[PDB]
């Protein structure tokens, strides 16, 4: 699905992609949800992940109107949710999953610089 970004970017400020984020992202929630999965185990694959399809395109529009980096989060809408692995390299099963609304705060093929941190995350549809 199509995601959104959030950041704690300050509305008034000129560092190039603080500028982008203020006009691209919502303010960040200081209390996200991270719920322990009981009992169950889920299959991950960093290499088949359509979160590294959308991030990569926002870095395009970042530069497009560009002319200190801050943390950006990526998050899901209703009907969907992010499962995160608490175990793991990038592929195969994972017993300790928890569900999250957003990713961690990310300092910025740079797709795969993102996969260096993405690997733990995956989307599912309710």
């Amino acid at each position, epitope marked *: 699905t199509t995601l*959104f970004c959030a950041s704690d970017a300050k509305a008034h400020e000129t560092e190039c992609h603080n500028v982008w984020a203020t006009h691209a992202c919502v303010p960040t929630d200081p209390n996200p949800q991270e719920i322990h999965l009981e009992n169950v185990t889920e299959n991950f694959n960093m290499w088949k992940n359509n979160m590294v399809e959308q991030m990569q395109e926002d870095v395009i529009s970042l530069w497009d109107q560009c002319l200190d980096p801050i943390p950006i989060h990526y998050c899901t809408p209703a009907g969907y949710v992010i499962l995160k692995c608490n175990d793991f390299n990038g592929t195969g099963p994972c017993k300790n999953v928890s569900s999250v609304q957003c990713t961690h705060g990310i300092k910025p093929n740079i797709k795969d610089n993102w996969r260096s941190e993405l690997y733990k995350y995956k989307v599912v549809q309710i």
Partner: antibody
Amino acid sequence: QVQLQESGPGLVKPSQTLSLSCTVSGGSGAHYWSWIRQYPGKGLEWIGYIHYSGNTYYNPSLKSRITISQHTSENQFSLKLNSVTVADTAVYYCARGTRLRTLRNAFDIWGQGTMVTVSS
Amino acid sequence: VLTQPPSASGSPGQSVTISCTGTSSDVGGYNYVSWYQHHPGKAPKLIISEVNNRPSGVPDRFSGSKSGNTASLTVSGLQAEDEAEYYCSSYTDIHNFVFGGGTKLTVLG
């Protein structure tokens, strides 16, 4: 399913203080909850919005005449416009603004509009 | 604040285009131009987002664009049901928005 219904009092006296409620109905993210008015023709003016987080963002041309608020209770939200004149006669729409990529800074869902009239 | 033409006509089948002239801080300062279809007494449909993006369930025949500070919207292959009024909006400044006066797209019968 996500619809919006506006509700409100249709007449107000000048110098009084208009206030409208919009009732969401689908339906629950990171959207924005907005008030936009139509001066028929003219004519389309963004009033302001408030974020799910509670951040308000108003149109600078309303020098303090204006607040927007939430009732997570009854899945609704509302606007207060002050010191109205006949000028403020218009159709008032409520709407959902998104900051999803591919829809950033746009208004995906709208309200059916409702008329409001200022007169002594 | 944005400038549109008042009217725009075409027969069934024809193709039509609608200008929306802004300034460098409105259009041509951002790729956040949007377009709304509005039938009377009925709730506006967003049809183009972020300069040229059709949302789901919006037919391939509507299309967006912008050259300089003049964004523009096209309907290729008219049908009777496309007759409505069309507005454009653009993001501008730290959290603010502007619109056009609107354009009546008449499908000739």
